[PDB]
Amino acid sequence: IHRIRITLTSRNVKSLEKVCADLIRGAKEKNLKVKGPVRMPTKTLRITTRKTPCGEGSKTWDRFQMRIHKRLIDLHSPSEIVKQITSISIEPGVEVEVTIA
Amino acid sequence: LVIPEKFQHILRVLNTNIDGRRKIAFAITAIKGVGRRYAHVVLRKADIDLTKRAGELTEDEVERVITIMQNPRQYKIPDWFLNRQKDVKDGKYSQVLANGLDNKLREDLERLKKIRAHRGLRHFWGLRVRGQHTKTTGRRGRT
Amino acid sequence: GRVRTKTVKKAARVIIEKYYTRLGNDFHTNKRVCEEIAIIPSKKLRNKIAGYVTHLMKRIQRGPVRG
Amino acid sequence: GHQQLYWSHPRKFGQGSRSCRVCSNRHGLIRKYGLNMCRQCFRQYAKDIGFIKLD
Amino acid sequence: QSVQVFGRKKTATAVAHCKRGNGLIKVNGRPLEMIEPRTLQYKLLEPVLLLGKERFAGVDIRVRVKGGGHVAQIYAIRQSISKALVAYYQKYVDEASKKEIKDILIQYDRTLLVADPRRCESKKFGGPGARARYQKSY
Amino acid sequence: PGVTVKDVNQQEFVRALAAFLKKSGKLKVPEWVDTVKLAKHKELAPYDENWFYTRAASTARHLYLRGGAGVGSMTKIYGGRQRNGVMPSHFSRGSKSVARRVLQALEGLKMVEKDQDGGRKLTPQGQRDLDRIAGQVAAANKKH
Amino acid sequence: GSVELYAEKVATRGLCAIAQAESLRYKLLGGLAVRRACYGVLRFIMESGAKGCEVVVSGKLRGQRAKSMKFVDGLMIHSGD
Amino acid sequence: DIKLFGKWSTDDVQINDISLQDYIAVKEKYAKYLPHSAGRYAAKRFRKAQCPIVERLTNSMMMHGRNNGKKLMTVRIVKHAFEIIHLLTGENPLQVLVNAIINSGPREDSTRIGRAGTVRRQAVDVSPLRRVNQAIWLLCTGAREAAFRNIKTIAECLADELINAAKGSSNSYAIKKKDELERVAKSNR
Amino acid sequence: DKLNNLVLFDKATYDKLCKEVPNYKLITPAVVSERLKIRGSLARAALQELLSKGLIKLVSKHRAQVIYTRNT
RNA sequence: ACGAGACUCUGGCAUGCUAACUAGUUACGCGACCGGUCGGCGUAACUUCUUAGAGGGACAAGUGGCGUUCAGCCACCCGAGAUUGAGCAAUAACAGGUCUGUGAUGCCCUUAGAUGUCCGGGGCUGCACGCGCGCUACACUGACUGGCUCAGCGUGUGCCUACCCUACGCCGGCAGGCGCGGGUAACCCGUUGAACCCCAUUCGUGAUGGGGAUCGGGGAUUGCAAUUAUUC
Ligand SMILES: [Mg+2]
Ligand SMILES: [Zn+2]
Structure with a gap:
């Protein structure tokens, strides 16, 4: 199938942007037409906990946070070229999922 | 304009006095078994005008209102609308009204006290029966 | 309170003493000059330094400055 | 017999059926997102997990 | 000939599509004198009342509004309509007419053209809201 | 001219449509409407x-505005x-049976x-x- | 057969606080006096190019009453990102 | 042609107090259709003097907890009682409100002793802004407790309160409180 | 102290409702209720009846406030 | 030099850039009603609206006063904004709290009719009374009953681990029940049809239709058990 969608998830923005730019550059050096990086809304995981290990003192809370950023790339290519582009030693921490539509 | 035909300022129904100035469906609420919803359903199925006050209805209207109040299931009032559904002893669905019916059926606490159930014991001791804390609440009338 | 910290003031004084020829009375040219000749890791700090440089240029315009 | 009695009480929903995956305690447990750790263990391992303080 | 200029208040945002037409003003498909509270109807009519029907006579305006609260959707609609007329006049008529309409609108109300930046403040622990604190006892 | 639901007042539109439904005498009503x-x-x-009848009119108008409900x-x-x-107040949903019977009565009127x-x-x-009733409402005291 | 484990060396041991903490731990476990071990770890960290460092040891250092003992050198920031 | 609501002009309103002319905003830049403008008059000191007097009254109406933030209700309560002031007096309601503001503001009152003290009070003069603020507060309070536990609706209590204050009558709560404050200031002179 | 308002008119109070209320500068259910010792519901009904007969002019109507004035 | 500031996150502005069938908007076709209304259908333009990256943008910078004419303060113009809110936070100290968070712990105590551990049943709520945090009120600027119309933050099917969010159809006042689907989620719930508020209605100044404690009789739901009454 010529419809290939790459989903990129990461907790670090800089790594995700570097990987997306590298992937699109590789897909454009080859004569492939690629739909640009669609940026899904960021998911913010929140946990609020009491600071103390006990129940004593002024009630203070830690507000922890995790942020998940999601990118989508659609390209028209045979699967072999997609495999060539994907395996380019991507930056650690970025999860890449290639799906056939 | 007040009705000349002896506008009943005070009306006696079930050994209770209802006020003729009160709008119907709220005047008959004074009966100790009838409140708001029961009154409205009774008057709807008795087909009387709800905008009238209790003093402008005739004797026949009040009579049929009393009968439909005392025989709800005979006029297609649903069984879930009553306050004595599946009554213990005689498993009859009914609506208990006023002195002699509501307060006497209230005197089913003696059943609980005779079997010495925990709820009956809490009733006998004047305490609270529905599992509420008694530390810091209800301290009125307990010296 | 718009009181500048010693970081801003010493940075501005050194910048002025070193590059007085390139500077003037314009904030928007001074900030470009500062970002070209200096390494200020923040944009807000750069803007504060450029603003104080403009103030000091106006001050030297009508005489001397102790710094 | 003891075989049918030992640990025979149902443990499927209450606090007796959940515990910290680190310290095996049963109090102050965080079930959100599948962490299944108590509050103190979470404060201890939050940076390793990836939860960092921003605001 | 169209502009699509929009305006906001709190979370409510309204986009006004203004094209060459014959004086139609609708909000979410309903005519202007039908918006909900109807106590602030004059707040909606302020642009056309200030500028006159003659200036809106050559345009059709259709406003799509979504976001938080009746009283914000109002003020968002009026901001969008004012800015849409200003932009249409600037792009398709001249700078002088734009100047006069902008002067009238700004003199009457700055919020007709420039959005209010105020937003809800966060809640901090230790109190029911942004700055209120729970009762302290000794 | 031409008048739709969206260019007339919704309250008096609902009143007029409810009057029309009651006058038609083809909408079947449950026997527990008075209880x-x-x-x-x-x-x-x-x-x-x-x-x-008022609730049927409201439901039909709502289906007019946003269909698929x-x-x-x-x-x-x-x-x-x-x-x-x-206790503090909370949001609560309406009766399911009344909505289901209103919808089941609107069908069978072929509406x-x-x-x-x-x-x-x-x-x-x-x-x-609905559009004819809206035209009637507009031609009425809404504007003569 | 899918998981596998390498093992590499730290570029600069003197600049890894976990490594220095382990070194101090196993120095104290070896009977070395607290001050000698802390000062040695401090000096090794400073000689490795660190801009500054701080070693704190707390507990029953001398006697039945606990106390804390701090060794600092160079520059050390505390606030901000 | 910027009549309030859609019926009350401002061209005929005369403040005629000189002292409060700069602090009652009703006339030309402060002629608006509605007493509801969002507005940011509390951001900087003295700006509330640019707020139209009808909006100041409307804001002062939202009081005693259960009515906090309900400004549409209060603009309705002003629209009514303007419709009622016109019926009762035959004059422009804006003029009646302005006259009430003039009449109900204290001119002197007492503070704690002078430079310092903890025994008695010393008389002092009132700022025009504080005059207008206190007038609005007193008029609103008088209306509020006239309508409480009474079949007389609000927008009737407020209308009669404003009418009495415009007349200077002692049937007004605001006039009584103003006289009380002024007399106490007189005694502590 | 406790007021005792009527719920329906008597001939004396139905009088002084047909030749003085149509002369008030302001006619309101609360005003008529206080000046005729009648309940709010009766006052509203009487004012609606007077308006139906053309003796009263409606100035404004609202769910919370209805205002009438004399026909002059 | 540390702390303050700087810093990071966050709120406001960009018709400028990058670019989108898991977001749309215009336009054009095809339909449904009386040019208009279409969260009716479909496909070009494109990115204002939505997302989220890069960069820009504000500095007391401009003007006028006050100041040693300095550091700065006040006011005004232009401006999206002329003080957004948090996070982190020094030296040093407390016999502050926590051994009941820990396979963190030193010393004691106990260790087999056990202070280990399961398993029944009680308790932790027990009520003459005192004290904190609170919820609902004392109404008419309100209750009731219909009608109308607007959000945002976010959470959804699990290592063990049983337990998810729910559209639609039907049955039942109701609480519920029964079938059928979607969703591991900008994809489905959902266009989150929130409440107050708005509009109309009835009440009519009194413990009143305010207010809902207490208590009786029925019906369901979750659970292995609901009595001391889980909840509805
Ligand atoms: Mg800081
Ligand atoms: Zn743990």
């Missing part, structure tokens, strides 16, 4: 005693504040039909009826 409460968060029965959607439309006594994606929608006959 039910319309919501758990209600305290009394409706005051009108013709409330079924079913029970649950209409139950959420007619939900409201529930006062829990000495409402099931939609493919699940739910209810207005039939072209229903759209025409």
